[PDB]
Amino acid sequence: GFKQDIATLRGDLRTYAQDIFLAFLNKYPDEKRNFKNYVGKSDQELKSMAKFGDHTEKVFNLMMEVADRATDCVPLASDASTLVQMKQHSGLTTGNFEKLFVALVEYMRASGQSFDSQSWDRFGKNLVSALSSAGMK
Numbered sequence: 001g002f003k004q005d006i007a008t009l010r011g012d013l014r015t016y017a018q019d020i021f022l023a024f025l026n027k028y029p030d031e032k033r034n035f036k037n038y039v040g041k042s043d044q045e046l047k048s049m050a051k052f053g054d055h056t057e058k059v060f061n062l063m064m065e066v067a068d069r070a071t072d073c074v075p076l077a078s079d080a081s082t083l084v085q086m087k088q089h090s091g092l093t094t095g096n097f098e099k100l101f102v103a104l105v106e107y108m109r110a111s112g113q114s115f116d117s118q119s120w121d122r123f124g125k126n127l128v129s130a131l132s133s134a135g136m137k
């Protein structure tokens with residue numbers, strides 16, 4: 001289920017984080033509006049860019065903590081407020097997060113691994129709801 005998937009992801013997290021964020025950027029290329037330094041690069045070139053690897057893994061480090069702290073795929077309100085307030089997230093909207101989680105769910109479905117894709121779909125939805133409640137537009 002969802003808790004086991006957090007452990008699975010954590011066991012190879014730099015790879016999963018980069019592959020999922022690449023699936024997001026390739027499904028929604030306009031999102032690079034918020035990632036101008038990743039423009040004009042293939043997947044293999046991004047995986048050789050230090051901030052791409054370090055920032056993507058740090059994003060997913062925290063994503064796994066928020067998932068682990070959640071109850072039945074519902075994140076803590078303190079985590080949603082942290083994600084709305086962080087300066088790095090200024091001017092993001094909830095649709096940016098919805099799209100990341102569509103790509104994450106599609107990645108899991110395409111995997112041959114028994115990820116609980118429905119629970120990640122729920123978590124993405126519930127995160128978007130918590131972000132909205134905490135003031136993200």
Ligand code: MNR
Nearest residue numbers: 031034035054055058059060062063088089092096097100
């Ligand atoms: C499509 C837009 C974005 C979505 C969705 C998104 C979703 C999430 C998310 C999901 C639950 C979590 C957890 C998360 C967490 C972070 N996030 Mn976030 N994030 N996020 C940015 C856009 C987005 N984040 C940006 C832009 C930056 C700073 C610039 C750069 O780091 O590329 C940042 C930065 C960060 C950092 C700091 C990285 C560091 O400096 O190395 C963390 C941690």
Ligand SMILES: O=[N+]([O-])c1ccc(O)cc1
Nearest residue numbers: 021051052055056059100
């Ligand atoms: O996965 N993510 O949403 C990310 C990944 C890398 C980054 O620099 C910012 C956000």
